[PDB]
Structures are given as structure tokens and as C-alpha cells.
């Protein structure tokens with residue numbers, strides 16, 4: 001019974017830790033999505049300036 | 057005994073999941089760092105262009 | 113009250129209240145029934161998604177444009193498009209608003225008569241008026257003379273106007289437009305391995321054409337350069353990955369405008385039908401038309417067309433005349449801006465086809481004095 | 484009244500009233516006649532023990548599953564199983580309850596027609612409806628799109644669905660499933676000395692597979708590690724003692740899913756038939772299917788499969804798309820939970836095959852509009 005309690009406690013902590021890690025990776029994935037949007041927008045704006053200047 | 061085996065299996069599963077999640081988050085952080093490096097490089101090139109345009 | 117300046121077009125329906133700068137709602141004119149079976153129950157699946165909704169579910173639809181070349185080939189779908197435009201994109205009941213449709217030159221009469229009959233019977237508007245798509249584009253430029261080349265997506269027409277007096281014998285309507293360029297681009301992409309067949313993938317090819325293609329200043333030099341270096345190959349990411357690289361297909365797709373022999377059409381390019389349209393005019397207004405050549409319509413937005421066309425016309429025209437090509441940045445909505453200006457005029461307020469007049473003479477009223 | 488959501492399956496029959504969270508009675512679908520002679524008189528020995536009763540007397544029985552690969556090969560035994568399920572595990576007479584069976588995709592017609600004929604003639608239900616086992620598993624996830632890989636015990640099938648519109652031309656049904664993995668495990672255990680032959684000992688090998696086997700993240704590294712260290716050897720106690728030690732048989736048994744060449748099957752693994760099923764879909768719904776890959780069925784419960792499959796698909800798929808694998812903890816009963824949800828819907832209440840309709844068109848009614 002004592003060993004079962006110990007193992008259950010460690011497994012519960014492991015579940016909590018993996019939940020925290022999954023939330024953290026979600027946050028960082030969202031941040032990378034935002035920065036990818038930033039690069040898309042800046043490249044699009046540079047292309048717009050290029051086409052405006054080449055087309056006067 | 058059945059409960060102990062269940063708990064042990066749960067612990068192993070959660071530990072492996074946490075290992076995979078840690079490796080994945082580190083890799084994604086590396087990718088974000090690389091894209092930020094590219095953005096900074098082109099931004100410095102544009103800043104040099106602006107420095108010359110100050111003379112324009 | 114305010115007037116509704118609708119503009120059916122062919123490819124993008126542009127609408128909005130009279131007196132503004134830009135159309136309120138712009139959305140593709142496609143009606144797509146679902147084609148697969150459908151297993152989820154209660155999902156709320158409709159029988160036809162129109163407008164911009166069918167550009168998001170296009171993976172399981174069969175989009176079909178209701179307007180082929182200016183003319184309308186499928187009246188039920190066009191009625192559905194109009195109903196959507198009035199009720200969901202503007203949310204104004206048509207019972208309390210005049211409408212100002214637009215129509216290409218030299219179109220079949222039955223199309224115009226059916227259009228007015230629908231507007232008066234189904235939607236029950238107070239009064240509607242049909243205007244030629246080129247006079248509006250001339251309004252928007254703030255001119256009163258000039259020869260306007262309105263290369264839309266359905267049909268390219270070239271109406272010369274002087275001092276407000278249109279010249280009906282010098283209108284040169286050509287049926288090459290953006291849609292044929294999309295089909296030709298989709299046909300030459302197969303030379304690298306990319307095959308687009310489904311009616312949904314025509315939209316992807318259209319996006320490629322819009323974002324990458326450009327008109328070459330000199331065709332042979334570009335063909336020679338693209339065949340030696342690799343400074344032209346621009347890549348593009350499909351809606352699922354697998355980036356593609358467009359080589360000399362970039363300036364070969366819109367070159368069809370100046371050499372309609374590419375898609376097998378006999379006629380001369382848009383660079384020579386303008387000169388022919390000018391030469392049919394009288395000998396004393398040719399200088400003004402030369403100096404005030406106006407571009408409009410969506411398809412004239414290719415980067416570098418206002419220089420190629422000027423070079424071609426300068427080659428054709430006499431050396432003394434000055435050739436100037438007006439290419440405003442708001443080219444795409446030029447017709448609608450002109451429509452708003454025309455509907456906002458006080459002098460025009462008595463030209464509408466009032467409903468009692470239609471009740472007395474039938475749908476054939478449109479060909480009469482109220483043009 | 485309430486509906487009976489039965490789910491024949493192949494290996495475990497799961498049943499229960501509509502509107503609950505879990506099936507009421509889950510028991511193996513085996514019917515085993517005794518094989519020895521029997522000397523005690525008056526012991527009350529029956530002629531066939533079905534369901535969970537024959538998993539306790541399996542020492543003197545010859546268990547034989549009545550469903551081989553989705554299809555039903557022994558109709559009398561299947562009728563016996565259904566009779567047991569209705570009368571002893573639920574204790575509700577079928578004369579007062581609609582039934583909702585489930586069937587794998589691409590199964591023979593005669594199987595489905597015989598199923599409906601039995602349900603209407605022998606058990607005499609008021610109305611029954613047959614549904615594809617993958618749409619239900621998609622219901623249970625609360626999605627409306629996604630490609631579901633339902634690796635049961637009889638047959639593994641992969642049905643892609645978008646916006647509720649199933650794609651009938653992209654269903655990839657493969658006949659490798661849990662039973663073949665049990666046979667392969669029983670065949671590779673002989674490499675250490677343990678021989679299981681009797682049809683009763685197949686159950687013991689199944690228990691070994693359930694409790695010990697796991698899917699390796701990388702196969703070659705695991706094969707190298709298990710051949711040097713001894714950190715993998717897990718022991719297990721047979722029903723009579725004599726513990727056994729499983730070495731690298733642990734991850735070699737379920738590896739057959741990703742390399743069906745192990746059991747001599749030609750086809751590609753479950754990691755590549757999903758990608759092929761996606762690529763047959765249209766080009767505009769591939770991103771959504773990539774992002775909403777759903778796992779279901781019992782055999783997808785191996786510890787570590789939701790990572791191996793994601794790694795494999797990410798290797799195959801384009802680098803830009805995001806690959807996500809939905810693996811709910813209630814995987815085993817996902818099909819039945821979805822069945823309960825579907826039977827509890829009000830919109831679905833008029834899709835049942837009413838008995839008078841069957842009387843008018845015969846058993847071939849199932850292929851008709853009431854699918």
C-alpha cells in the first residue's frame with residue numbers, strides 16, 4: 001500500500017508536469033506563428049514597394 | 057499489486073512524454089531563433105539603406 | 113434616399129452606396145453546389161454557397177461562374193448572387209433604394225431586358241438604370257474626353273469618347289480577358305509538371321497569376337534572358353506546401369494580351385485594337401485621344417503594362433503626336449467610383465427608369481430614351 | 484423509448500442504451516462448445532458457453548470467433564451472440580427498442596442484408612439502422628472534419644471526412660489488425676521456447692500483448708539497445724506459474740503495424756496508408772486533414788503510438804503543414820460513444836429503417852436511401 005501511494009504520487013506529478021510543458025509549447029508555438037506572420041507581412045510589403053517602384 | 061503495476065506504467069508513459077515534449081520545445085525555440093536572426097539581418101540591411109537614404 | 117451602385121462584373125461583384133470612395137463589399141461571383149455525399153447529420157449543410165463563403169469551402173464544391181463573357185448564361189444563379197449582395201453584404205432591402213447596374217458594350221438585348229425585368233419584379237426596386245462600363249471609368253478619371261480600354265475579367269472593350277459625345281461606330285469589343293489568361297496560364301504550367309484540373313484549382317492558378325505574372329517590356333529579350341540566367345524564377349507556396357517555381361511562364365501568361373495568337377484567337381492585341389479604334393475616329397480628334405488614353409479594369413493591373421502599351425502605340429502612331437497613358441492606382445474600382453460619381457449627380461436624378469414607366473411599356477423600356 | 488446502441492465489433496461486443504457515457508456490457512465475442520467427454524451426471528453442462536462465461540471455462544472449450552475480418556462467417560453463432568447480448572447482458576426484450584448496429588467500410592453487401600434480415604425477423608425489433616464505424620468515432624471527438632484511423636481488432640480502415648461530406652473515393656481499408664498481431668506475437672514467442680498452440684492459449688498471448696507490448700519510437704535503435712543491455716526484459720506470470728521473460732519481442736509485435744512485411748503482407752504500414760488516403764483528397768482540404776488526424780479503435784492503445792505515427796507522417800508530409808494526432812484517452816469505446824451521441828440526436832430520429840418499410844421492399848432496403 002505504501003509503495004502504491006508513492007508511485008501514484010510520482011505519476012500524478014508527472015502528469016501535471018507534462019500538462020505544464022504542453023501549455024508552454026503551445027505558447028511558444030503561438031509566438032512562432034506570430035513571428036512567421038511578421039515575416040510574411042514584411043516580405044509582402046517589400047514586394048509591394050518593389051512592384052510600385054518598378055511600375056512607378 | 058495490480059494498482060502498483062498500473063501506477064508504474066502511467067509513470068513511464070508520462071516520463072517518456074515529458075522527454076519528447078522537452079526535445080520538441082527546444083527544437084522549436086531553435087527554429088524561432090533562426091528566423092529572428094534572418095529578420096534581424098534583413099532589418100540591418102534596411103537600416104543601412106535608411107542611413108544612405110538620409111543622404112538621399 | 114441613397115442609391116445602390118451595384119456593378120455585376122464577371123469575376124468580382126462590387127457594390128456600395130452612392131457617394132463613397134470604395135465599394136462596400138467586394139466578393140467573387142461564384143455559386144458552388146456541394147458534390148460529395150455528406151455523412152454528418154445536423155451539420156447545417158446548405159445547398160449552395162455563394163460569394164466569399166464558397167471561396168473557403170471550395171475544397172468540396174464545384175464553383176461555376178454565372179457570367180461567361182459579359183452576358184449572363186445562368187439566370188437563376190445570377191438572381192441568387194444579387195439576392196445575396198442585397199441582403200447579406202449590404203443588409204438593405206431593395207424596396208427603398210434605386211439601383212445602377214453596369215453592362216458591357218455590344219451585349220445581347222435579351223440580357224439587359226431580363227436584368228431589368230428581374231430588378232423590377234423579384235427585388236421590386238423603385239427605379240434602376242443601366243450604364244455602359246466605360247463611360248463610368250471615364251467619369252472616375254475626371255476627364256471628359258479620351259479613349260478608355262476597360263480590360264475586365266470577362267471581356268475587353270475599348271470605347272472612345274470626345275467632349276462627352278460617344279462615337280458608337282468606333283467601339284472595338286474583344287473577348288480576351290482575365291479568364292482566358294487564367295486558362296492559358298493553367299495550360300502552360302503543365303510544361304513543368306504541375307497539373308491543375310479541378311474547378312477549385314482554377315482559383316489557385318488565378319492567385320498565382322495575380323501575385324507573380326508581369327508584362328515584359330520587350331518580349332524576345334525577356335525570353336532570351338530567362339533561358340540563360342535564373343534571376344526570374346520566383347517560387348510560390350501552394351495551399352498545402354510543395355512550393356512551385358515559375359520560370360518564363362511569368363511574362364508569357366500576360367503576353368497573350370498583345371499576341372492573341374497564343375490562345376488561337378485571330379484578332380490583334382490590345383496594343384493594336386486601340387490604335388484601330390482611334391483611326392476610325394474623325395481626323396480632328398485623334399490628337400486628344402492619343403494624349404488621353406485611359407486604362408481601367410482589373411486585368412490592366414499587371415506590373416509594367418503602362419509602359420509596354422505606350423511603347424507599342426508610339427511605334428504605331430505618327431512620330432509627332434504625344435502618347436500618354438493614364439493609369440490611376442485605383443484602377444480596379446475605377447468603374448465603380450465612376451458609377452458612384454454619376455449616381456451622386458443632381459443633373460442625372462431624372463434619368464432613372466421609374467417603375468410606373470416600366471409598367472406602361474414593359475421591359476423593352478431600357479432600349480428607349482431612358483437608355 | 485430509448486435506443487439500443489449495439490456495436491458488434493470483432494473481439495469485443497460493446498452495447499448499452501443510448502445517451503450514456505460508456506457501454507453497459509463489454510464482453511468477448513466467442514462461442515465455445517466443450518470438446519471433452521464429460522462424466523459427471525446432472526452437473527448442468529450446457530452445449531455452448533458464449534460471451535464472458537467462456538473466458539472462465541476456456542480450459543475445456545474450443546473458442547471460435549464468429550467474425551473473422553469485419554465480415555461474419557458463421558451466422559448461427561452470431562445470432563447466438565446477439566441473443567445473449569439482448570437477453571442476459573442488458574435484459575431488455577428487443578420488441579420495444581430500436582437498434583443501431585455498426586459495420587466496417589467496404590464490407591460485402593450480403594453481410595449487411597443478412598444482418599438486417601435477422602434483426603427484423605428473429606429478434607423483431609421496431610427499427611434498426613446501420614452506420615459506418617468511422618463516422619461515429621468522428622462524432623465522439625466532437626469534430627466535424629478530420630481523417631480517422633480506426634484500427635480495430637478485425638480490420639483497420641481509414642475514412643477521411645471534411646465538413647461532414649465523406650469522400651468515398653479515399654477510403655483505404657487494410658486487413659491487418661489486432662488479431663494478426665496476436666498471431667504474430669504467438670509466432671515469435673517460439674524463439675525463446677514458449678509454445679502456445681491451443682485456441683485457449685491465444686487468449687493468454689492476447690493478454691501478454693495487451694499488458695507488455697509497446698510501440699518503439701525508433702525501431703533500429705530499440706533493436707540495438709535490446710540486444711546489448713537487459714533493461715527491457717519484463718516478466719509475466721502465466722495462469723499457472725512459470726513466469727516468462729519477454730525481451731525484444733515487446734516492440735517487435737506491434738511494429739508489424741508500420742511494416743506489414745513482417746507477416747508477409749505486401750501493403751504499406753498504417754503510417755503510409757494515412758498519407759496516401761490524404762493525398763487522394765482534394766488539394767484544398769489537405770491542411771485540415773493534416774491538422775485533425777484522429778485515432779480510434781482498440782489496437783491504437785499501444786503506449787507510444789501517437790508519437791511514432793506523428794513522426795512518420797511528419798517525415799512524409801510537406802515541412803510547412805502542422806501534423807497533429809488526436810488520441811483521446813477513451814479510445815477503445817470511441818465508436819460506441821459516438822454511436823450513443825448519434826442515436827440521441829433529434830435530427831436523426833427519422834432516419835431509422837421502420838419495419839413497414841422493410842416489409843414493402845425486403846432486406847435490400849438498407850442499400851437504399853435509408854443507408
Ligand SMILES: Nc1ncnc2c1ncn2[C@@H]1O[C@H](COP(=O)(O)OP(=O)(O)O)[C@@H](O)[C@H]1O
Pocket residue numbers: 120121122123124125263264265266290291294318321322323409410411413414444
Ligand atoms: N493585382 C492584380 N494583378 C493581376 N491581375 C489581376 C489583379 N487583380 C485582379 N486581376 C485580374 O482581374 C480580374 C478581376 O477583374 P475585374 O475588374 O474585377 O473584372 P470585372 O470587370 O468583372 O469587375 C481577376 O479575375 C484577375 O484575373
Ligand SMILES: Nc1ncnc2c1ncn2[C@@H]1O[C@H](COP(=O)(O)OP(=O)(O)O)[C@@H](O)[C@H]1O
Pocket residue numbers: 491492493494495496634635636637661662665689692693694780781782784785815
Ligand atoms: N490496452 C490495450 N493495449 C493494447 N492492445 C489492446 C488493448 N486493449 C485492446 N487491445 C487490442 O484491441 C482489440 C480490441 O479491439 P476493439 O476496439 O474491441 O475491436 P472492435 O473494433 O471489434 O471492437 C483486442 O483484441 C486487443 O488485441
Ligand SMILES: [Mg+2]
Pocket residue numbers: 121122245262264265409410447
Ligand atoms: Mg469591369
Ligand SMILES: [Mg+2]
Pocket residue numbers: 492493616633635636780781818
Ligand atoms: Mg471497432
